[PDB]
Each structure stands twice: as structure tokens, then as C-alpha cells.
Design a protein around this ligand. Sequence first.
Ligand SMILES: Cc1cc2nc3c(=O)[nH]c(=O)nc-3n(C[C@H](O)[C@H](O)[C@H](O)COP(=O)(O)O)c2cc1C
Ligand SMILES: Cc1cc2nc3c(=O)[nH]c(=O)nc-3n(C[C@H](O)[C@H](O)[C@H](O)COP(=O)(O)O)c2cc1C
Ligand SMILES: O=C(O)c1cc(=O)[nH]c(=O)[nH]1
Ligand SMILES: O=C(O)c1cc(=O)[nH]c(=O)[nH]1
Lengths: 311, 311
Amino acid sequence: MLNTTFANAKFANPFMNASGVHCMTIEDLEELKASQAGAYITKSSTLEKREGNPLPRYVDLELGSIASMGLPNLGFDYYLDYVLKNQKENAQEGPIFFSIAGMSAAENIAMLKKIQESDFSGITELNLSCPNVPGKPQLAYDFEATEKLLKEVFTFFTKPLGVKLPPYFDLVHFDIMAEILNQFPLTYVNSVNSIGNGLFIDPEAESVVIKPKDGFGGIGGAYIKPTALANVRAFYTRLKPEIQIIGTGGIETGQDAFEHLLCGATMLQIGTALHKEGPAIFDRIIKELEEIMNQKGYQSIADFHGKLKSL
Amino acid sequence: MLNTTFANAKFANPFMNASGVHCMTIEDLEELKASQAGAYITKSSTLEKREGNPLPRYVDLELGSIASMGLPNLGFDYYLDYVLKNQKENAQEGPIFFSIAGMSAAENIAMLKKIQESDFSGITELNLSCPNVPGKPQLAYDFEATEKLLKEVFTFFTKPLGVKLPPYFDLVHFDIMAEILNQFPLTYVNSVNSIGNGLFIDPEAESVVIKPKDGFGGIGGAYIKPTALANVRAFYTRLKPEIQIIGTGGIETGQDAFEHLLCGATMLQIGTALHKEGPAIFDRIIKELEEIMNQKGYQSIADFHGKLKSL
Ligand SMILES: Cc1cc2nc3c(=O)[nH]c(=O)nc-3n(C[C@H](O)[C@H](O)[C@H](O)COP(=O)(O)O)c2cc1C
Ligand SMILES: Cc1cc2nc3c(=O)[nH]c(=O)nc-3n(C[C@H](O)[C@H](O)[C@H](O)COP(=O)(O)O)c2cc1C
Ligand SMILES: O=C(O)c1cc(=O)[nH]c(=O)[nH]1
Ligand SMILES: O=C(O)c1cc(=O)[nH]c(=O)[nH]1
């Protein structure tokens, strides 16, 4: 029932981890391969291996999560080696997704050139929205800089590319970004990265709960679903149809998934809830989404994809 | 215990309604006068009366609210008349606050000139962040336009002025806005207006739940508390001490109030929770905040104001 076509590839179901969650090592990635996720994505990588921010840097909250990981990762070459060996095995349905989050424009271009030159045949996600590296703003809140970067990328990069975007809150920003993105042969936009620079306080201790940046961290989970849905929907009605959408933010239940898809998402990623539950989440949420479709008499996601009704 | 000094005036406690909630008519305002609120503020007004957006335009959610009111209000003259007759009675502790949300720069300047020329002795709040008028972006996401407007305002407006700001999600935006605001003799900044252009879906009906703007509305309540606290804290550490802060967003319990005050807020406004509970909320939340202070041995808000600890 959950068969999906995305980036010209076939997936068994739309569900994936979100980048940063359960995907740091090869062991993590093999556990996602082994789970019922339709597809999976590596941790955003940088050219060099990174320890990330000081701890405590992730905390579970009743309504979601707050974190400031600081892009801990094992470095671009580690991930590139892994995806290049797994592609050769032909041991799963659908390509692996490879996320990069260079610490500068130069780092991103260098990694994209290495991907282009490699044999990698999967999908790349360019992360323009990490909100947790000290002193490094979300690039995709700088429309001029984003356009300048993407224009350079598309002078050479011919393989499937999506962009991971921060949440936007003003409809003219959606208009501006769609106009920028629509001039390129982009494969997809992935909406939303964590809501940037939120704060959570333990009122008893009178103190923040993560160490980095005086407690300021990206917010994920049930807090952000309204914004995530709006960002998916707003881009679905403004992007050219050649650019598909991955929906991320506040997905825990089949109902949440069913609301992203109604908005126009084609693939779905799970961050916070997967952090909390582990890869068993995929079998649970798939069954919850199929139960909603069965109740409604739907036998494919095309029966309601994109079909959110206005009043 | 909750005695507060703000804008050079004395208030019995820091709690207020948020603009837009329970403050549309004279009867609404008199009910706030009669409640235990330390202060209250008028609905944001425009030069002409406005019916606002089509209905359904407000919905209660488990984790807060979604709304697109469209600035329904009874027009500038009506509110100016009301505050100018209530000042004359000398019938409460502390000045009334008067919110304005001109549909253009010209409307705001014209309303500020009328306030300046009138006898009004209370406090004015310039709303730069309504996210619900179709085709009118939040002005305070346009740094150049904000600075240009505020420079013109401070050529003539000498009375106490605060600005109601949208949530920011990137620390460089907090730097940019503090640099803009710190050049002026502003009384306060009120952080946060609702999170703009969120979406809420009834999955059974497969449709949005408010009529205007295809169901996109400002989000309030528990969803936005992490963002509101971060905005209050980020401006408290960047603004000159002459500019005080009003905290707004997700306040329902004494604990929530205590967190905003630890961040640096001096006055506190209640939107969604007051919409749900009515003016009886002020007695309840005052008692809850007093119990927190009693348990901690605090006899004034200065015992913990601004004292949030980092790790
Ligand atoms: C622990 C953690 C680390 C994350 N790291 C990344 C990352 O490396 N790259 C990425 O694009 N975003 C990352 N994110 C953001 C998520 O992919 C996702 O966009 C965000 O958590 C919203 O989804 P959620 O509500 O399911 O958590 C991270 C999130 C979390 C909680
Ligand atoms: C029904 C409604 C209408 C509102 N109208 C205004 C308004 O006229 N002016 C204003 O500055 N903000 C308005 N707000 C936003 C609030 O003052 C407050 O900033 C927002 O609701 C966040 O607080 P809360 O979490 O307590 O709701 C509106 C909020 C609601 C729910
Ligand atoms: O590793 C990080 O901190 C991280 C990266 C990113 O893009 N998003 C986020 O929520 N955290
Ligand atoms: O009346 C409105 O729609 C309104 C005004 C504003 O500033 N904030 C909001 O949440 N609603």
C-alpha cells in the first residue's frame, strides 16, 4: 500500500530516518537497512571528522527534543566509502541518501565535487540549515548566499540532489525561496530541519539543560509539527512539480505521517521519535498508516497525496 | 511578592493579557481591569475599524492555538477615547498599554502622531509582527524597513514605546535586531508574537481547521514556549539595560511564568491560556508563581529575575 516513487527510484514505503538520528556509524546504518524503513540517510558530514559540541547536548522532552549536537560525524570519506561499498552489494530496494553539511561554501563544493567524481549512484542531501554550530548561521536564511551557492553547485553536479531547509514563517520567504529553487534541476527539498535556537529550562535547578550555546538548541518533535506541515504545504503549492518534497518534523504516529502526505510530502523522515524508540518505530508507524488508509478505503498514497482541503 | 517596576511605573504583579486576547471592546478591557492582572493592553488597532478575516479563524488545540484573526478591531479612535477616559478616573495601579498595528508605515506614523498629540500618559506598543493579514508580511523580518520606520518614529514620539516582535530563530538575527533597537530610546521589546504561518489539520476530514489563508495561522501556547523563552533570553543578553522586556508565549502556569522571569522578562503576557480560561487565570497563575517563590524562599522577583544559569 505504501509503495513510493521518488527521485525516479522505487521505495517500499516513504519512511526514513532524519539525518542526524541513528545514522552516525556503519553499525547504525546497517540497523536502519535491517529495519522496515523504506530508505535511509547518513549523518550530515563535514570534510574532517568532528567530535561535535560538549555534553549534555541532547535532551528528551515531553513534547519533543532539544539538542545542539554540533555536527559530530566520522568525516566525508568514511561515509563515501560506506555508500560506495553498499551500492555494489545491491542489497536493498532504493538508493541510500548521503547528507553533507560543509562548514563553508568551499567545503560543500569540495564534497559535492568528490561525490560527482565518485561512482556514487544514490541521492545527495545538501544541508543548508544546521542551527547548532557556534558562530555559523543557517545558510538558507540568507537568500542571496543560498542562490549564489546553488548556482555554483549546478555548474557541475548532475546527480540527484535535494536541499534540507530550515523552517520559514513568513509567506513571502516561501515565495522568495521557491523562486530561487525553481530555476534549478533540483530533485527535492526536505522541509523541516529543527526549529533553531529554542530554549528549555529546568525550573527547579533554574538552569538550561544542554551545555552548548548557553542552552540554546534546535527543537524537534510535537512542538514543531504545525510549522513542519506548513512548510511542506507551502513549498508543495509553490515548487515546480519536478522538485519533490521530503516531509520532516513531528512525525511519531501514522496520523502525523498521513498529515504530511496530505500536505504534499512524498518521502517522510523521523528524527526525535526514532531517537526515542529506535528502528522498531518503522514497523509500528507503517502499520498505523496502513490502518488509517484501510479505514478510509485507500489502497495507495496517491489516493490522498497532496489532497489537503482548504475551507 | 510580585511587585514590579516597568517603564518607570509601578505594577502590583507582572501579568497582563497579550494583545488580541480579551481586549477588543470596552467591556473586555473593564473585565481585565477588574481581574488580578497587574496591567492590560488593548487589541492592536488600525486607523479604521476592521471586521477581520472570515470564520473559523481561531481554534483551540491540545498544545495551544492556531488563529488568523486578521486584526479585527474597533478602530484607533475608539481605543484612544477609552484609554483617555480611564486615565482621568485614576482607577487603577499602573498605566494602560495601547497597541497599534498600522496596515502601512503611514498608518503607524499617523497613529503615533495622534498618541503623541493626545493627553495619553500610558504606554504604547508598536506591533511589528502580525502574521495573519493576507499579503502583509511581518515587518520585523525586514531589518532595513524596521530600522527606517523606527528612525522616523523617534524623530517625534517621546512617550513610552515598546515593540512587539516576531520570533527569531538565528542568533545573528538577534544580533542585527539588538543593534538596530539599541540606538533608540525604546522602553521595551515584547518577545514573542505568535509563530507565523503554522498549519493544523483534521486528519479525519482531511482538511485545515481555519478558513483564512488556506488554513495557515499563527501558533500559540505550549508549542511555542521554547522559542518564546529563547527570544526573551537572547534579547535580555543583547539589549541595553534601558530597554526592558515583556515575555509572551506559552505562559499557562506559574512555572512557565517563573521560566520567562528567569530569562529576563519583566512583564509577562498571556494569550492562548487566557483565551481558554478567561480572566480568572490571573488569580490562579499569581498564586502558582507565589507558591514557587515560597518554596524557594524568594520574597521578590529580583531574587531570580534574569538569573537563568548556563551549564
Ligand atoms: C539529535 C539530532 C541531530 C540532528 N542532526 C541533523 C543532521 O546531521 N543533519 C540534518 O539535516 N538535520 C539533523 N537534525 C534535524 C533532523 O533531521 C530533523 O530535521 C529535526 O529533528 C525535525 O524532525 P523531528 O521532529 O522528527 O525531530 C538533527 C536532529 C536531531 C534531534
Ligand atoms: C486570538 C489572538 C489574536 C491575537 N491578536 C494579537 C494582536 O492584536 N496584537 C498582538 O500584538 N498580538 C496578537 N496575538 C498574539 C499574542 O499577543 C501572543 O503574542 C501569542 O498568542 C503568543 O502567546 P500565547 O502563547 O500565550 O498565545 C494574538 C494571539 C491570539 C491567539
Ligand atoms: O548536528 C547538529 O547539531 C544538527 C545538524 C542539523 O542540521 N540539525 C540539527 O538539528 N542538529
Ligand atoms: O489579529 C491578528 O490576526 C493577530 C495580530 C497579531 O499581531 N498576532 C496574531 O497572532 N494575530
